[PDB]
Amino acid sequence: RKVLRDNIQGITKPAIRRLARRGGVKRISGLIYEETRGVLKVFLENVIRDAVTYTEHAKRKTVTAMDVVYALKRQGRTLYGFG
Amino acid sequence: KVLRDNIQGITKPAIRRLARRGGVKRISGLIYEETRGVLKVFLENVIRDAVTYTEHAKRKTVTAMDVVYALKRQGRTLYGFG
Amino acid sequence: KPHRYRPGTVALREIRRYQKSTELLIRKLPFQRLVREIAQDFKTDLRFQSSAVMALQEASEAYLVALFEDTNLCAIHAKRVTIMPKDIQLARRIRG
Amino acid sequence: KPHRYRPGTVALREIRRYQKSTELLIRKLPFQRLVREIAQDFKTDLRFQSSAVMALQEASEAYLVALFEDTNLCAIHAKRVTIMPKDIQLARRIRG
Amino acid sequence: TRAKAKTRSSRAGLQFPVGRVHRLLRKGNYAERVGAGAPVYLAAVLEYLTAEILELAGNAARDNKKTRIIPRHLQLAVRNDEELNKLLGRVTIAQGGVLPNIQSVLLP
Amino acid sequence: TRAKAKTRSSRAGLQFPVGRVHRLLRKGNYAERVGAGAPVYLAAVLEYLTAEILELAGNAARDNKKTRIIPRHLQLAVRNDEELNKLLGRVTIAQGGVLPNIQSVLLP
Amino acid sequence: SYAIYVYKVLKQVHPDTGISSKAMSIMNSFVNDVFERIAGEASRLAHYNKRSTITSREIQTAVRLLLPGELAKHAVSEGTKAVTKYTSA
Amino acid sequence: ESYAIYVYKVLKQVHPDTGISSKAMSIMNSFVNDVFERIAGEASRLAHYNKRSTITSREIQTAVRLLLPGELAKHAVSEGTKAVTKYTSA
DNA sequence: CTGGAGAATCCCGGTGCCGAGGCCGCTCAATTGGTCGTAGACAGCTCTAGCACCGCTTAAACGCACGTACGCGCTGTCCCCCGCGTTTTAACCGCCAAGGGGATTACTCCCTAGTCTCCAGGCACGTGTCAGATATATACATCCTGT
DNA sequence: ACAGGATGTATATATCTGACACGTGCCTGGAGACTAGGGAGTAATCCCCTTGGCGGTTAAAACGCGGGGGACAGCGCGTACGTGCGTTTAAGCGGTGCTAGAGCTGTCTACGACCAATTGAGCGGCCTCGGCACCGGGATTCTCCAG
């Protein structure tokens, strides 16, 4: 467990089914799971990437929660509950 | 005289031509009245906000800039009038 | 023999022709009177700039163009080619 | 005689249950290592706050929830109850 | 030696700090000058909205016989008000959840 | 009597006016202070983007055998450049029309 | 923070009800965010009309721009009343 | 005051034998002013989030990297960086 | 379709722990009390252009006749994802230990705002011409009737 | 589907004008140069919490074996909107005259920023107990089998 791995399954399939239930989804296609990994992956890359842009500007080696919050704000998805 | 029922002045053929410019190929008959209502409410919101600027602006005539800022207010910035 | 053409052909010609051009497709005076009439609820006998009304026509028709494109995306998405009010309602819901 | 529930029963029960509750559903360490793993492209051996990963889960799950609600609006709007990838794609297009 | 100080909020019969909010306005890069009635007026509006949300959250807390407010009630309160939901349609509240909302065609 | 002046744009090999952009920055309520490399950097970026869109626009005007640029070519330039289109996805240009985009299923 | 002030308002609305720290942080984020929105819109209102001062007029108009219906109306009622009260004192 | 003739100078760099219209120039001025305000606003948030009270070319550079997608941002950093460097030796 | 059986979850009852809530030093920030400079309200006036009004045409709206091309439900096909138990991992939980680095403070540099003068690119405002408005005729393009 | 005919539309070609392009008088805003203040870097530190290790359990991921329940196409019904055309209008075009009011200019007052000194509410840390967690057991509730 040193460098990149098969952690794309880390958001697991039953976890996707649970989150979909919390989202109100009643039936889930088999293609939806792969679609969720890809679309969610891309989205997170965008937002977290922007957070990293803040952090690399911030002259830090540790990503703080504020970078994630401001990153969410950057896309008009402002976050309440972390400062 | 005072104006009344000018919501029908935005004619159905004009709406057809716009929808063709909008890329619509077939238009239901209910769409025309739905469009008058939806577009009406929308314009009430944006223009109303422009009037809020104007009444704040201590003017009796609405300038184009008010409309531009109103469009910006809803994140629909307008190029070509100031 | 009439030269009455077929349903959809002239529509397509309007699509290509009017999407090839850019001029406004609504009469100035009725639209302007509609603006003043709805505007009545703030000041009676309101005076408006002509070019402002023209800008209102610009914004209005462009907004309709984009909204109906989204509507068309929903209709084709929902396997239709005839737009329905529900598509417009869905568009307004997702747009906020 | 197995004690097995019908399709949708457990689904709807967990809908009401997990929508009634508000606790996080993704495992801490795998998701955090996935975050660091994707984050590898900027700095090697990154140190991340635990609470930052907590916020990442919050934004991720909430974003997926809202996005799938819109997907559901499209599917039901398109006369389905089983969501498809192109609904997510349409949602991304309307959102941008 | 000098005359006693009372909060400008109390002079307006308010709880929110006119001074601190006013300072955030001054240091917030918004304009060269901020009118004296502005922080009083703003603090009154925010305290009013706050009272609305807290009042609804209090009610929601009563609906489960609990005296300690948790984020879930704030979620219910925000999404159950049309004008606040219109104010907060793109915002995410941590640990709030979602209002129970299942489309009619999905319910049996 | 004083020394030979020279625009900051030319010293940076730029066309866009450093001074007015810097003035808008100062009087635009953004920060206590704005760094010296900021206006030069900004004018270079905007000038570069301007060159990109005017280049695409000029080519588009050439495509219709005309020498005067009209808004239509600006609309074409914006919606045809993916990154600029992303930058301007929710902005409305008056008298611009749209790109010819008919959904494939709608064509015969 | 503004924590104890939200607690003060809570004691005005529900004297026997408490509140978690995490929810209090959320409310602090709400106050700061909406605050920044209101001040930003007031800032552009000053800009548009070539004003360099944000007064009660700009705030009032901005509130009317940002808040829908009765929240705005009663916000003007409570705010205006309050400004009157301070104008007395 | 507008950027009209400056856009014309850029036009003379890209297409010397091509003309323009006042309305399209107004559109371009609106584009420059709008994108300008976006960049300055984001730079303001960048200074604020880390409680910096100074917007420098570093904040502008990062801001540009935030706003412009991909290769346009890379060439923006290229042209701006080269430009600023070229100026700082004069 | 109507009626009986069972478990999950809620709920009903009973128990102990710790974080929320209340206290307690200890700041440091909001308040008051002045003063200074100025943004902006106000009054009258200018004079554009908006209102108001005149007059004739047909672009455009409205309506009708006609046909066509569009949505939608049902049944079947099939097909695939949900449900649950079982195994297995390894996250989780509970536990052990160093020091990286976040955050701080202390120094000191040096970068950026502010001014005054000067002047030159640009501002407003006129002028001529070729872009563009207009005219006329046609193969090509597009449709469509016809075979 | 294949072929030929008819007409719109851009195109070939040909003509006429005005708004764009360029010039001028003038100005006011940007550059030079200079100062002064103060934001942020650098160095080195403390100690939190991150990293990195041990160790057992079962939550949870993965998988398999049904099988229930959902997407989708065909297809036939069956509608209603588009296209064009003829009539009619008032917008359009263009033409007339005045003054409402945007905008300016000159007033002068009023308001918000600013600084310093004090201080009391609030900040940070520190307990305390009943909210909450935990547990055990039945009603309700919801599902599902049964006749």
Residue numbers in the entry:
A (entry chain B): 19 to 101
B (entry chain F): 20 to 101
C (entry chain E), D (entry chain A): 37 to 132
E (entry chain G), F (entry chain C): 10 to 117
G (entry chain H): 33 to 121
H (entry chain D): 32 to 121
Q: What wording appears in the published article?
A:
The second class (Class 2—distorted nucleosome) was reconstructed to 4.0 Å and shows a nucleosome with differently organized DNA. A closer examination revealed that most of the DNA and many histone core α-helices are in a different conformation in Class 2 than in the X-ray structures. Although in the X-ray structure the distance from the dyad to the opposite side of the histone octamer is 66 Å, this distance shrinks in Class 2 to 61 Å. Our structures show that H3 α1 moves 4.5 Å in the Class 2 map compared with the X-ray structure. H3 α1 coordinates the DNA at SHL 1.5 and the movement of H3 α1 also pushes the DNA more than 4.5 Å toward SHL 2.5. H4 α1 coordinates the DNA at SHL 1.5 together with H3 α1 and moves in the same direction as H3 α1. Although H3 α1, H4 α1, and the DNA at SHL 2 move by > 4 Å, the contacts between histones and DNA stay preserved in the Class 2 structure. As DNA slides away in the Class 2 structure, the interaction of the H4 N-terminal tail with the DNA at SHL 2.5 is lost. At SHL 2.5, however, the DNA is distorted and does not resemble a B-DNA helix anymore, suggesting that the DNA might have adopted another conformation at this location. In the structure of the distorted nucleosome (Class 2), α-helices of the histone octamer rearranged but remained attached to the same DNA SHL. This class reveals intrinsic nucleosome plasticity and shows how the octamer can be distorted without breaking contacts with the DNA.
